[PDB]
Amino acid sequence: MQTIKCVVVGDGAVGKTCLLISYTTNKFPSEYVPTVFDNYAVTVMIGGEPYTLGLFDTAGQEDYDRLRPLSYPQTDVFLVCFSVVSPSSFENVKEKWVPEITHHCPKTPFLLVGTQIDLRDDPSTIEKLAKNKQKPITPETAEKLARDLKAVKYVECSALTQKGLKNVFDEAILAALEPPEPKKSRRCV
Template identity: 40%
Template sequence: MATIRKKLVVVGDSSCGKSCLLTVFSGHQFSELFENYTTNVQIEGKKVELALWDTSGKREYDRLRLLSYPNADVILLCYSIDNTESLANISEKWVPEVKLYCPNTPMILIGNKKDTRNVERSQKEQEPVKLEDGKAMAEKINALAYTECSAKTKEGVRGLFETASRAALRGKNTTKNECLLQ
């Protein structure tokens, strides 16, 4: 059986859980750092090699991050459930950037750090993002799917990457095959 190669690019604010999510999915130990990695999955009877591209959310890496977009098959837009600003940045920063460089690439919205939703907070701490708010953002940005997960507990991680793999197998939203790099 021939292996199908697909590229998943993960974007979102710094410290929103992107690297931990990828590390846990790829079978490594929970960590703060992640480098681009390839892992194999079986989806719909097909052997798929997923190239997982982690990106930095820091402003000083904006120009470097653009090099991750060409040939992306799926974009994973991540925010942290314990940080409402990271959800706002999905529509303010990340979607405009993705649509500029990968206009026809399927996007999946991911609420990371689901395990933090039920943690007791001091009065000074902000409330976590509600499930309904995540779903509303997914609809607003026309995401293919919305899911929440926790790299810490591994809840939802496998299902997320199954959804992303299926989206990658289906292909782009139009006949264009490449992300644009201007």
């Protein structure tokens, strides 16, 4: 049967794993975030046909720069994630993630994914960011970065409340649908 491979990249603490667990188990892991870097599968109906959506988690720490690319082969679509309450992670999108992804897979599309949006309305978080003269990343600022980096589009969500979650992956699926053309797919090689 038909398959789509999606790889999730982004800095540590961005919420990549929670994003995948909430989506695949419809339940945010509030007790203990699984430590293992795994890959998940979910079957999705597309035009009355079964499709397997392969979601691949990655290690965001700099210690894995040499090994991370090993997961990129055959990738149909990339999810480049950053936390909206983490200006640092947002800047690494342009400085580190898109460059890395385009270097190894120039033709493969990617979506810019803002995460942890529930924290934008968290007094505590605002205060912490304020004490350093920082404010949450806004959808407008992110949309501009997505446009300039040539991302398919900018989407955002919260794995906690699950808001915008399903949307992120519906969009990843739409961006992944490889036009039948003989053979000129954007699958990474």
